[PDB]
């Protein structure tokens, strides 16, 4: 008999530890082992163990925790993760809680009413082993939730009845073993989306009546009590936010037609004056954010208030209702009373319990702080995209669970699948604000730093995971205007490990350096806020790649050139994206980049800068001959001549784009003249025209991984932005040497066109 283990100390302890092992082997979202442990113990033996009054107590707690872990912990953790995200639809059920009963002498009970909020769908697969090749066995083992609900309700009633009389043998032994597992099961059940209004009323009928909070409970019991009350206030805050959105729908629906009517009235009774075009530019400009910002400010005597004063009274009524529903001037009062009483009864150990009690007391006394912390995270979407948003939330919860578990092959594959799902979810395109509210970039960055942790330059464990993460982050920053600013903070981090993923022309997209370039790309404000705590790091990386040999090509079989042109190209690409935005050169960024490049001369090519190679002419002719002779390559492959050529072209392009200007400011500023003189001393003009005059062959198709006209295009851009064409002699000269042969080669084309 299992009850005989009360006296046997060995078997008691060993079975308690094997129950703890059953719990730990499937604690997190591991369902392939839960599907085994269910039958390995039983389906209804868990009920019998939580149901039996005669238990040693250790086995009782073990069986309770085992039931929680193998039947409820997965969905409990899913809801705990997606619990602070208040995603609301726009269906008519949302507009039904516009009353949020607070007036006429009633406040309501926490958890009673309508949810109408986006929550993860729960489902439990049926445990069956005669079914060979089950579909997924990924959700959870199935359990009779209703039977467990009735059983735990009646047992909680019996347990509080027994504890009210202070017996000498509580169930399982101590009052700890009596209460803690039972109230933990009840807490996770209330979490996992059961105890509808009917049963929740009966539950509150044993803690509310003014009970369970009046007994002399130990520390591990009152800790679970504090957690339960914290959830009871969390659902109340959720109801508050739902009511806020319900009222806001109709309020903004009225206000939109009100402002449209006033705009049409101005259109009709225009009556031309000087302030009319000012009102027109105010209506056209001032995007909806600052439009709402201006039309919502009336608390003092007089300020900027529009004509619709009638809706202001409704707004004041709703705000007053909100303030009287909040903690400012009975659940909050009773929770506060219980917390202060528990603190005054005796000195409390368990600093975790003390902290939980105090944060509960503080949030009950504050009330509004939950609102100002949760309103930045709430978001209403639609009544048509509900299933798409549900799929998005499910994939995000999968990503969060995979982040919680350790990284492996199957974990990496599942994370890649989840990233693909959230990229093709079709809501990522429409609502990026919701993406920032959920914090998808945050979790993806956490996954990326967990993958990158462990190795600096020796080996990057779990490859292609950082790649999928960087691609997702690139696309997230791409389809936006403020996600770039939100991600700019992580740029200072990812620039340190930006060296990974380079030296491999297989991922021109996903890379930390490329996601940095995408975050600063096409954003003047970010290009200006990009100060230099990291530009110096970038030029240091460029210097290192220009000095060393990257120790990656000698392993493949390359001739070990004394400098790396594949990482320098990417570094110069990032510097170009940071210095040249929207068609104009950022002045101070160009200045500091030039300063760093002239203080560290090893950033340029060895055959162009230094006491060795002559200049760009000889450098690029050497590059062409390296491209021509296959004896200096690696036996899709990296053509070393082409790499040197694109590196020099990217350096020339960066210098031309970091040129001061096309002389608008240079006609009056001296530092512009100094920077132009430095650029001219670096790159001469004869070198430029000689490099322009190469007369590339134009083919029977050929390969596009050689000398491409993009090099001479960058040369022309540098010549135009630094030297320019202003005198007839040099103009005709250049036109004769470089432009006529290229134009003739481009005109010699009838049908076979392979190089656009």
């Amino acid at each position: 008999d299992i009850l005989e283990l009360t006296e046997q100390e060995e078997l008691l302890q060993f079975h308690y530890h094997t129950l703890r092992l059953y719990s730990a082997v499937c604690a997190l979202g591991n369902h392939r082992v839960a599907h085994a442990l269910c039958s390995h113990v039983d389906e209804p033996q868990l009920l019998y163990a939580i149901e039996n009054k005669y238990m040693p107590g250790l086995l009782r707690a073990g069986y309770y925790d085992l039931l929680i872990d193998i039947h409820l912990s997965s969905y409990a953790t899913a809801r705990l993760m997606m619990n602070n995200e208040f995603i609301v639809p726009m269906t008519e059920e949302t507009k039904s809680i516009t009353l949020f009963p607070d007036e006429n002498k009633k406040h309501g009970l926490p958890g009673i009413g309508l949810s109408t909020s986006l929550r993860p769908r729960m489902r439990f697969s049926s445990p069956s082993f005669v079914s060979i090749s089950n579909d997924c066995y990924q959700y959870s083992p199935e359990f009779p939730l209703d039977i467990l609900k009735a059983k735990t309700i009646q047992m909680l009633t019996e347990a509080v009845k027994e504890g009210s009389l202070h017996a000498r043998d509580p169930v399982g032994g101590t009052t700890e073993f009596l209460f803690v597992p039972l109230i933990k099961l009840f807490y996770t059940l209330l979490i996992m989306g059961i105890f509808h209004n009917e049963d929740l009323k009966h539950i509150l009928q044993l803690i509310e009546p003014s009970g369970l909070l009046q007994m002399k409970l130990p520390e591990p019991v009152k800790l679970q009590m504090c957690l339960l009350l914290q959830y009871l206030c969390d659902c109340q805050v959720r109801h508050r936010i739902e009511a806020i959105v319900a009222f806001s729908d109709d309020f903004v629906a009225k206000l939109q037609d009100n402002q449209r009517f006033r705009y049409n009235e101005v259109m009709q009774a225009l009556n031309m004056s000087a302030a009319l075009t000012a009102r027109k530019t105010r209506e056209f400009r001032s995007p909806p954010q600052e439009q709402i910002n201006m039309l919502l400010n009336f608390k003092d005597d007089k300020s900027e208030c529009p004509c619709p004063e009638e809706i202001r009274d409704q707004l004041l009524d709703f705000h007053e209702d909100l303030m009287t529903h909040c903690g400012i001037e009975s659940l909050q009062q009773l929770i506060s009373e219980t917390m202060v009483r528990w603190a005054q009864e005796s000195v409390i150990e368990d600093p975790e319990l003390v902290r939980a009690m105090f944060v509960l007391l503080h949030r009950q006394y504050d009330g509004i702080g939950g609102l100002v912390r949760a309103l930045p995270k709430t978001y209403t979407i639609n009544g048509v995209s509900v299933e798409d948003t549900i799929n998005l939330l499910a994939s995000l919860g999968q990503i969060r669970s995979l982040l919680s578990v350790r990284m492996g092959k199957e974990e990496e594959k599942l994370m890649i699948r989840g990233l693909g799902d959230i990229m093709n979810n079709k809501v990522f395109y429409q609502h990026p604000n919701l993406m920032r509210a959920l914090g998808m970039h945050e979790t993806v960055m956490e996954v990326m730093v967990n993958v990158l942790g462990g190795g600096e330059s020796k080996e990057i464990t779990f490859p292609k995971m950082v790649a999928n993460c960087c691609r997702f982050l690139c696309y997230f920053c791409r389809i936006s205007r403020q996600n770039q600013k939100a991600m700019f903070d992580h740029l200072s981090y990812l620039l340190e490990n930006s060296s990974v993923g380079l030296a491999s022309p297989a991922m021109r997209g996903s890379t930390p350096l490329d996601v940095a370039a995408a975050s600063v790309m096409d954003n003047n404000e970010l290009a200006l806020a990009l100060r230099e705590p990291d530009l110096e790091k970038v030029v240091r990386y460029l210097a290192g790649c220009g000095l060393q040999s990257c120790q990656m090509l000698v392993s493949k079989g390359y001739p070990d050139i004394g400098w790396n042109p594949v990482e320098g190209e990417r570094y110069l690409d990032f510097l170009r994206f940071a210095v040249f935005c929207n068609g104009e050169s950022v002045e101070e960024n160009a200045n500091v980049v030039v300063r760093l490049l002239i203080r560290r001369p090893e950033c340029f090519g060895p055959a162009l800068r230094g006491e060795g190679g002559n200049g760009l002419l000889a450098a690029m002719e050497e590059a062409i001959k390296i491209a021509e002779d296959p004896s200096r390559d690696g036996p899709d492959t990296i053509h070393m001549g082409n790499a040197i050529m694109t590196f020099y072209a990217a350096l020339i392009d960066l210098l031309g784009r970091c040129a001061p200007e096309m002389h608008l400011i240079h006609a009056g500023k001296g530092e512009a003249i100094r920077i132009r003189s430095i650029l001219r001393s670096l790159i001469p003009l004869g070198d430029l025209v000689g490099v322009i005059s190469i007369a590339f062959q134009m083919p029977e198709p050929d390969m596009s991984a050689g000398f491409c006209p993009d090099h001479k295009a960058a040369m022309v851009l540098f010549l135009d932005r630094v030297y320019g064409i202003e005198v007839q002699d040099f103009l005709l000269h250049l036109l004769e040497v470089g432009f006529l042969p290229d134009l003739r080669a481009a005109a010699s084309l009838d049908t076979a066109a392979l190089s656009x």
Binding site: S248, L296, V340, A343, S346, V354, G367, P376, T378
Partner: protein, 315 residues
């Protein structure tokens, strides 16, 4: 967008007053140890638990703010001073001075919201010439000979905030053409002037009364292995802010027009410099020849020369 605006400028506009009643009914011994004393002991144990970095601790950041906001024609002045002293007694007879000292020492000299809230609490606990709290702090620092508190103060004074002109020029260039955001958050030019003035006001309140013992302990920490000169750190920060003000004047020298961003940066600089000067006055007041010689044998004369120059030209 309506909900975002409502969250932004409708709800957090000082719509509650509960700190005093909260501190009162937490300090009430309903019956041992009071709940407020238990909370202070919890914070002290958390600060004494040796780690590598001071955690965020939203609990502490939310409770230090409350305990600081709880605090604050002759009879009414005396009565309000006595009420302030009573509140300070209520919330420091349970060891809040030790809590502030431990939280400052457990930051290793790194600017953060925890340090900001702790300095606000120290200011609210040392408002006026409260000598009891100063004596408690001095006895604690002497009976626990630790240099971590002093090096954390030195690091904070060395890396709190200084005006820069490059960021202001970049902000000007941004607001010249970019109308997507208007750059409503005027930051990156003076990072946290609130924290800077809070730190220097905390030092001023530490040396508020003419405590020769504390004025000498802030100069030479006798009994400790290594000593750091808080006076020299303060005069160095004064020189730095003087150079920053001089550069900002050189920038705004010639156009004879000061925009609202310029005026706000001027006002923040003036407030920070005034707080630094008040701290120096509280350091040197009384016949404290130690601090007097320390200020006379430093770069204070160059700082005051530059200050006189900028004063004349700006006025």
């Amino acid at each position: 967008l309506f909900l975002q605006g409502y969250e932004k400028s409708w709800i957090e506009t000082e719509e509650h007053y509960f700190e005093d009643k909260l501190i009162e009914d937490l300090a009430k011994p309903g019956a041992r140890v009071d709940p407020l004393h238990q909370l202070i002991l919890l914070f002290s144990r958390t600060a004494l638990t040796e780690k590598c970095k001071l955690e965020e601790d939203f609990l502490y950041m939310a409770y230090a703010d409350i305990m600081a906001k709880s605090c604050h024609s002759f009879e009414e002045k005396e009565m309000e001073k006595q009420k302030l002293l009573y509140q300070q007694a209520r919330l420091h007879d349970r060891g809040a001075a030790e809590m502030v000292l431990q939280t400052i020492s457990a930051s290793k000299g790194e600017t953060g919201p925890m340090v900001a809230a702790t300095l606000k609490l120290g200011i609210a606990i040392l408002n006026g010439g409260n000598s009891t709290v100063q004596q408690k702090m001095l006895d604690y620092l002497k009976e626990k000979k630790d240099v971590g508190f002093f090096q954390s103060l030195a690091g904070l004074m060395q890396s709190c905030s200084v005006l820069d002109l490059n960021a202001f020029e970049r902000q000007n260039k941004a607001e010249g053409l970019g109308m997507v955001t208007e750059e409503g958050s005027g930051e990156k030019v003076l990072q946290d002037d609130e924290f800077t003035c809070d730190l220097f006001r905390f030092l001023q309140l530490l040396c508020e009364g003419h405590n020769s013992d504390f004025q000498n302990y802030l100069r030479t920490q006798t009994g400790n292995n290594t000593t750091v000169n808080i006076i020299i750190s303060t005069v160095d920060y004064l020189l730095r802010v003087q150079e920053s003000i001089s550069d900002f004047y050189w920038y705004y020298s010639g156009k004879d027009i000061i925009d609202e961003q310029g005026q706000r940066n001027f006002s923040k600089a003036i407030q920070v410099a005034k707080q630094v000067f008040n701290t120096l006055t509280e350091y040197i007041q009384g016949p404290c020849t130690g601090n007097q010689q320390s200020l006379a044998h430093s770069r204070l004369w160059d700082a005051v020369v530059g200050f006189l120059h900028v004063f004349a030209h700006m006025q």
